[model samples]
Target: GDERFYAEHLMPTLQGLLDPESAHRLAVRFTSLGLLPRARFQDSDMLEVRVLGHKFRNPVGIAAGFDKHGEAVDGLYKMGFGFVEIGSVTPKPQEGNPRPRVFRLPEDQAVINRYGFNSHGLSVVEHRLRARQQKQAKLTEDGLPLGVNLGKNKTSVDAAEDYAEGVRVLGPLADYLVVNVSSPNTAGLRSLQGKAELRRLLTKVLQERDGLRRVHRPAVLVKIAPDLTSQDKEDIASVVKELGIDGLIVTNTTVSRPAGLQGALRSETGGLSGKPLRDLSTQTIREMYALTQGRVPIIGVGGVSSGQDALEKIRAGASLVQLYTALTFWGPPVVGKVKRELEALLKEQGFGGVTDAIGADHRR
Candidate 1:
């Protein structure tokens, strides 16, 4: 039902030989080939709660940066993620940083990456998604929603225009769309988080999203940086309330290294994730949840590698949780473990549902 299957059986052997980035690519290829295995115990129950108007089977999802090309969405869903997010995809193809860009700090059980939004571009990803949807010609199984995380090109002339391109091309296909302007690898990407800059960028993307043809438009959420200050978060919170944006993905990644990261690779210059990020990410969720007065929904990411971690996210005010770096360490079964654990945690905590648990700490 959990990582015990592969973590004990195959992961140790496989991970021993594969370097960090290579192993990541190998997992992507494995998913593309339908090679990863899944079991029944991973599934959590269903209560048709409306969140952004989509019936998510569970609140756990695959975060962006893992599936930059959208090739593995089906495989990840099969691995038991309630939904899968593909790509911090850009308008134009990007080569990103050179080799040895991702480091695995086994001692800390964390990963530091400066992948820089390396993507196959929006067009290639869109075609694959369109083709996959077309081939589901049979009666569809009840499945999860798919989200596309829109990213600007590394050398983009205008970041706002880049996001607009994303909405024009992929908004129709995504269950939800995330404007990802928080990746620290890009030279000036985080600068977009400024109130004036973020407002203009979001205003453009929202306008484009509204123009899409649909009765139920895909909700657009902004992913912010934990490195941001109170003013940054409050600036975002004010704009989020005023703009009528759908929700907020509480964080992207952190540039600040916490005090206790013991591994030598902790010095690697990129956003840190996994165990090191748990407390800070949850703290970020709690802060933003309070700022929004629980009116906004948040999808918490960073350090969520377990069911207990998922519950902690819920208590801190996350409506949903996402994982990526944790998957590299735990293998696929971790997905089911978290979902199953979250279900039990909700029951034990006396929460009616995941929604009931959101901001459980804050409400008290």
Candidate 2:
């Protein structure tokens, strides 16, 4: 019966939907309508995570791209993510790239997206975040840590100012901030990842971060592309250590598609994320961890669809993890499923807590 529903009804309905942009819009709108049912699961013995000078109820977070608009954050938190990141918001709203931008590679359980950095602009997102922060403050037991992901507009070549503007407007409301300079969809965005350019960007961002701290400062982390060379990675590690950055996301999506996907979706333009990304993302995590010597926090992401995937990232030296594409394939239930599986794996490996098992495989 279940197979029949997927094949006869769901498959045919999805086939009729050709435009990925329209599908994404409809999905976001549906999620915004609060129509999607909440995932149900039993809680386990997972410990709270204290990183970047904040407390996360657990290590799993909902990655960016799911909530480009700041709306539906509370709903996502209530759905059981430890934290939520909203936006890749630009200083001015842009339409992003043309339609038909997202593709699903079921054979690889992956997705290719060239949505660019389509957003409702920073001012609008800032206002929404301000309101959300106020509402979260008023709630007694419902508040969860939230971060804002900032990016440069399509036309802005002065990427430093783009990131600084984002910090200026949204920094106060965020628990932490991410300067996303690594997404392949945005032209010349990765140039900001250069050592000299990164130093300048982080310098300005850190200055703004200090200026904006009324009571406490939000931790600032940089999200790097997974396609960096060893030299690039070393350069970033040096800057992070020198600048005393709060954390590193250790990867955005990969532009280089690895061999082995037997699906038409593999040919789609844009960054590829999902199962194909797991090895590369994990390798990046291991490299960053080795380079940093555990001095800075690392949030591992990409291709985390199972508990074992999550565990592997942790063993490779990730202090925390996030996901977006996995949810697309496995549904929201995957979050708690991974959490429960992680707890069991920790016990099996004779680890008492998550922190204890972190980077266990990398210890040697």
lDDT against the true structure, per candidate, is 0.83, 0.82
TM-score, per-candidate, Cα-based = 0.95, 0.93
lDDT of 1 by residue, 1-364 (tens): 3467677767777779988888888999998787866546645453223477677777888999999999988788778777788889999998999988998878888888999888899899889888886432121225478888999987779889999999988887787899998899999999898999888989999999999988425799999887888899889999898898898886777888888788888998998888888888888889988988888888999899887898898899888889987888878878777777778878888988887788889768
The per-residue C-alpha lDDT of model 2 at residue 63 equals 89
Best by lDDT: 1
Candidate 2 lDDT by residue in tens digits, 1-364 = 1323434565447546645556656656655666554556544446466677776777888888999988878777766677888888899999888867888887788889998999999889977877666675543123357888998888886888888889888888788899998999987899889999899989999998999856446889999999999999999999999999899996789999797887787878899999999889999999999999988899999999777898899989998899988777655567777887887888888888778878888776
TM-score of 2: 0.93
Determine which window of 10 residues in candidate 2 has minimal summed lDDT: 1-10
Candidate 1, poorest ten consecutive residues by summed lDDT: 134-143
Query: What lDDT score is found at residue 200 in candidate 2?
Result: 90
Q: Model 2 residue 142 lDDT?
A: 36
Candidate 2 displacement at residue 165 in angstroms: 0.6
